[PDB]
Amino acid sequence: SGAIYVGNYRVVNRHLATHNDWANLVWEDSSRDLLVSSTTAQGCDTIARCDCQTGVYYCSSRRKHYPVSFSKPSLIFVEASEYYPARYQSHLMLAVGHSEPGDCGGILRCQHGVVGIVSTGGNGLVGFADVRDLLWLD
Ligand SMILES: CCS(=O)(=O)N1CCC(C(=O)O)CC1
Ligand SMILES: CCS(=O)(=O)N1CCC(C(=O)O)CC1
Ligand SMILES: [Zn+2]
Structure with a gap:
């Protein structure tokens, strides 16, 4: 498991995204196994x-x-x-x-x-x- 936290984005494996990730979907690509969701807190x-x-x-x-x-x-x-x-x-x-x-x-x-x-x-x-x-x- 694991994610990237940059600005107000969480990047995760698409096949590990949570219901919250999909509720706050910014972008997903099934061919790349990526999903980006919006976060309220700033990532480092x-x-x-x-x-x-x-x-x-x-x-x-x-x-x-x-x-x-x-x-x-x-x-x-x-x-x-x-x-x-x-x-x-x-x-x-x-x-x-x-x-x-x-x-x-x-x-x-x-x-x-x-x-x-x-x-x-x-x-x-x-x-x-x-x-x-x-x-x-x-
Ligand atoms: C090892 C190849 S794999 O296709 O089985 N797979 C990669 C790791 C994935 C995960 O940790 O979410 C799922 C498992
Ligand atoms: C390449 C592996 S790395 O990303 O962990 N790391 C080495 C490269 C940087 C440096 O040594 O100048 C520091 C960061
Ligand atoms: Zn580099």
Whole structure:
């Protein structure tokens, strides 16, 4: 689980959004696994405006931060897991790293701030939903 809090926006995995997230929907994209909802309280997170392909992500299933190399955002076919079926996902970044069910909403970040959140795992890979193209967030 986990979210980004920037200005008056909460960014979450679409498949983990709550009834409140949908009651305060700003934007959602089923192809990206993203949803943004409005918050009343100001968030502290800064979104990276960069094309970094290295950073650190938080892995709650190991309670560790891992440094990773990741691919640039692209359309990727996502393998079926124990709990979710297989599907295509846009704006997805892969790295070699640990991600299992529960790890979603872990934040990937670089010097310039938040790059994305964990969205996929399996097969010794972690997939991250990029948020850097969403300039309206900052
Ligand atoms: C590990 C691949 S997955 O498709 O099973 N999946 C990713 C993490 C998600 C979450 O923690 O919400 C749900 C589970
Ligand atoms: C790249 C991983 S990071 O985002 O956790 N971190 C390292 C880059 C910054 C620096 O070392 O100048 C500080 C922030
Ligand atoms: Zn960066």
